[PDB]
Design an enzyme around this catalytic site. Structure first.
Site, short mmCIF file in Angstrom:
data_model
loop_
_atom_site.label_atom_id
_atom_site.label_comp_id
_atom_site.label_asym_id
_atom_site.label_seq_id
_atom_site.Cartn_x
_atom_site.Cartn_y
_atom_site.Cartn_z
N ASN A 132 -5.49 5.23 -0.71
CA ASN A 132 -4.14 4.85 -1.11
C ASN A 132 -3.64 3.78 -0.16
O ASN A 132 -3.66 3.99 1.06
CB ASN A 132 -3.17 6.05 -1.06
CG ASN A 132 -3.46 7.09 -2.13
OD1 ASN A 132 -3.55 8.29 -1.85
ND2 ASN A 132 -3.57 6.65 -3.33
N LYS A 191 -3.84 -7.68 12.17
CA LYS A 191 -2.86 -7.07 13.06
C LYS A 191 -3.49 -6.98 14.45
O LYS A 191 -4.70 -6.80 14.57
CB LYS A 191 -2.45 -5.68 12.56
CG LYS A 191 -1.79 -5.69 11.18
CD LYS A 191 -0.39 -6.34 11.20
CE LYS A 191 0.37 -6.06 9.88
NZ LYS A 191 1.77 -6.60 9.88
N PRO A 231 -0.63 -1.23 11.69
CA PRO A 231 -1.05 -0.50 10.49
C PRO A 231 -1.68 0.82 10.90
O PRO A 231 -1.97 1.01 12.08
CB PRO A 231 -2.09 -1.42 9.89
CG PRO A 231 -2.83 -1.84 11.13
CD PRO A 231 -1.71 -2.13 12.14
N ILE A 266 2.60 -3.02 7.25
CA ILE A 266 3.77 -3.84 6.95
C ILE A 266 3.22 -5.19 6.51
O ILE A 266 2.74 -5.99 7.33
CB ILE A 266 4.69 -3.98 8.15
CG1 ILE A 266 5.34 -2.63 8.49
CG2 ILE A 266 5.75 -5.04 7.89
CD1 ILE A 266 5.87 -2.62 9.92
S1 LIG Z 1 0.80 -2.04 11.50
O1 LIG Z 1 0.71 -3.16 12.50
O2 LIG Z 1 1.01 -2.62 10.14
C1 LIG Z 1 2.21 -0.96 11.94
C2 LIG Z 1 2.39 0.16 10.91
C3 LIG Z 1 2.72 -0.15 9.60
C4 LIG Z 1 2.90 0.87 8.67
C5 LIG Z 1 2.75 2.20 9.05
C6 LIG Z 1 2.41 2.51 10.36
C7 LIG Z 1 2.23 1.49 11.30
S1 LIG Z 2 -6.59 9.20 -10.95
O1 LIG Z 2 -7.45 9.08 -12.17
O2 LIG Z 2 -5.17 8.86 -11.31
C1 LIG Z 2 -7.21 8.04 -9.67
C2 LIG Z 2 -6.29 7.99 -8.44
C3 LIG Z 2 -4.99 7.51 -8.56
C4 LIG Z 2 -4.18 7.44 -7.43
C5 LIG Z 2 -4.67 7.84 -6.19
C6 LIG Z 2 -5.97 8.31 -6.08
C7 LIG Z 2 -6.78 8.38 -7.20
#
Ligand SMILES: *S(=O)(=O)Cc1ccccc1
Ligand SMILES: *S(=O)(=O)Cc1ccccc1
Ligand SMILES: *S(=O)(=O)Cc1ccccc1
Lengths: 114, 114, 114
Positions: C97, C32, C1, C64
């Site tokens: 996010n 992870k 991640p 993931i």
């Molecule tokens: S992590 O172990 O989930 C690997 C990963 C996943 C998504 C973006 C970047 C890296």
């Molecule tokens: S906004 O009021 O839509 C709140 C928001 C949504 C998505 C990402 C970050 C912040």
């Protein structure tokens, strides 16, 4: 919602009031109260658009709802407008990624919006 | 399409022609005209991979189409190849997030691609 | 991640060990292996939240799997807790996010995770 602009335009060319104007205009455009709007501007970047290092911008707008065909067209007109007038970036050298985020996937204040 | 690389490699270690090479290689790889390719390199970052501050990179490729299992494997070989050759970053210290964007969710030139 | 935090808190205010703590805590939280955790901190950013330039952060966590309603609530409590304690950022001035990435859409080591 949150808006990010990354640009090769230098920090000194970003006018006073720019983040405030984005905040106000995005509140109006999205119908989210201004208290919620996050804005982030990243000048002085090493970027190119079509192999040219003339002014350009790579942006994103994330929102929970208020994202869609006509709405995104409207946001793009507004935001390209602001970048042209304020940063002197040609609209055809701007990309904006839109993300309709699920409430469960947006963290805030020790929790999420779900 | 647009490609972003964030790395802890110093700015002086990014070769002068790197943005141009990325642009040309991505145009070839994606089949998109070079005029549309956006590239963005962000050196000098405070990052770690597996707890280590050795060279690493966090990247993204957004495209309208041309994203998929085999294609992303091919892009990963190409891009890791370039990062290893040009920035001396081990491929096992690179992550690339691929995004297949809907045309309606990509703003450009006062509108979207929809 | 991978976890990214962009903040207007200055570099000098990021304590020694911050990336290591994020690495360790994200390993614990996501499950992870530590060797796969990438972390990226971007201080000194020009940003505002609700029209104010008091400390704030915009973050992302890509994984993931291990993304969902309860899990993201838990991540948000963990990460807002860290940003508050270490960077003195109020939790109600943080957005995160969350992205559940398809393995075929994450490149690493010349290929993808698919
Ligand atoms: S992590 O172990 O989930 C690997 C990963 C996943 C998504 C973006 C970047 C890296
Ligand atoms: S906004 O009021 O839509 C709140 C928001 C949504 C998505 C990402 C970050 C912040
Ligand atoms: S490219 O020609 O695919 C245009 C693009 C797509 C997605 C994000 C940004 C730009």
């Amino acid at each position: 919602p949150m808006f990010i602009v990354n640009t090769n335009v230098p920090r000194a060319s970003v006018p006073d009031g720019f983040l405030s104007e984005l905040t106000q205009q995005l509140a109006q455009a999205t119908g989210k109260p201004p208290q919620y709007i996050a804005v982030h501007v990243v000048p002085d970047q090493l970027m190119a658009f079509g192999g040219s290092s003339e002014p350009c911008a790579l942006c994103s707008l994330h929102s929970i709802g208020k994202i869609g065909g006509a709405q995104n067209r409207s946001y793009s007109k507004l935001l390209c407008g602001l970048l042209a007038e304020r940063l002197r970036i040609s609209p055809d050298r701007v990309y904006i990624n839109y993300y309709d985020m699920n409430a469960a996937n947006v963290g805030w204040n020790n929790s999420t919006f779900a």
